[PDB]
Amino acid sequence: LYDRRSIFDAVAQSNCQELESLLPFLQRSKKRLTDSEFKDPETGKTCLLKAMLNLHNGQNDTIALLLDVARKTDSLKQFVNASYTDSYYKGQTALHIAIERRNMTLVTLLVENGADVQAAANGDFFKKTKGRPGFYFGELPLSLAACTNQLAIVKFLLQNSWQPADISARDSVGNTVLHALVEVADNTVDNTKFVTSMYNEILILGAKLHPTLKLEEITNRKGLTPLALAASSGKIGVLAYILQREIH
Numbered sequence: 093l094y095d096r097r098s099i100f101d102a103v104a105q106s107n108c109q110e111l112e113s114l115l116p117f118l119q120r121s122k123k124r125l126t127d128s129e130f131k132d133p134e135t136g137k138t139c140l141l142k143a144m145l146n147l148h149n150g151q152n153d154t155i156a157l158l159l160d161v162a163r164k165t166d167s168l169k170q171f172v173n174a175s176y177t178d179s180y181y182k183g184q185t186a187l188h189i190a191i192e193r194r195n196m197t198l199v200t201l202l203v204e205n206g207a208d209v210q211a212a213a214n215g216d217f218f219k220k221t222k223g224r225p226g227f228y229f230g231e232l233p234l235s236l237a238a239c240t241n242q243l244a245i246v247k248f249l250l251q252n253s254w255q256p257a258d259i260s261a262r263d264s265v266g267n268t269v270l271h272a273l274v275e276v277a278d279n280t281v282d283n284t285k286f287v288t289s290m291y292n293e294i295l296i297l298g299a300k301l302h303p304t305l306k307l308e309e310i311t312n313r314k315g316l317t318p319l320a321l322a323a324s325s326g327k328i329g330v331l332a333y334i335l336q337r338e339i340h
């Protein structure tokens with residue numbers, strides 16, 4: 093037998109043995125790894141998510157086993173895609189965390205077992221500090237992966253076989269990855285530099301993958317193109333960058 097507590101402890105120490113008798117348990121009781129009872133009743137955290145927090149050296153194979161179990165009952169999709177429900181981390185999925193942790197291997201794994209690449213992490217933890225904070229990138233995996241300057245994962249999100257990212261999706265505020273990048277600028281020289289070329293990179297990928305899309309024309313919920321946001325919020329280095337590119 094297994095209660096929520098039993099597994100969460102097993103996960104905490106990366107124990108793949110105490111979960112030997114796992115699969116056969118919810119075969120008898122036909123319980124699901126996704127049942128109400130197997131989540132924290134106030135956050136919506138699952139064992140996979142506990143595993144995501146309890147990393148040791150960016151590794152945990154309780155994950156690999158946990159996923160494996162979910163397919164055998166085919167809890168698979170809704171398991172890998174369960175989100176936080178507390179006001180703080182609301183809408184955060186395991187894929188968000190893998191990226192937050194800069195972990196290709198776990199991004200790769202989650203996407204292959206069908207992580208939703210468009211899932212919006214929209215809780216107060218993913219918007220501007222109360223101050224609380226903090227920190228906004230907004231919302232969507234691609235946006236995250238860019239705003240944290242993680243090119244390879246930006247590429248893997250957009251290019252993968254399993255679910256390519258929608259490069260033009262808008263977060264709750266209307267912002268696309270180009271909008272979010274403008275928001276993440278802070279007018280320091282190294283800041284400009286990284287935003288500026290990640291921006292460049294996104295456009296190069298837009299034009300390579302989906303040529304019809306006029307990315308820089310897309311307005312956030314306040315009617316602002318990325319450029320116009322840049323200028324509304326005194327993000328000058330980037331403003332200068334965006335206009336200089338249009339000039340060629």
Ligand SMILES: Nc1ncnc2c1ncn2[C@@H]1O[C@H](COP(=O)(O)OP(=O)(O)OP(=O)(O)O)[C@@H](O)[C@H]1O
Nearest residue numbers: 100101104132137141142143145146181184189192
């Ligand atoms: N996206 C995140 N990034 C960084 N830290 C996070 C994130 N989400 C949650 N945390 C931190 O990890 C903690 C949860 O860690 P863990 O999953 O080990 O929970 P616990 O409360 O120690 O154990 P249990 O869930 O078994 O009671 C949260 O309280 C929070 O401080």
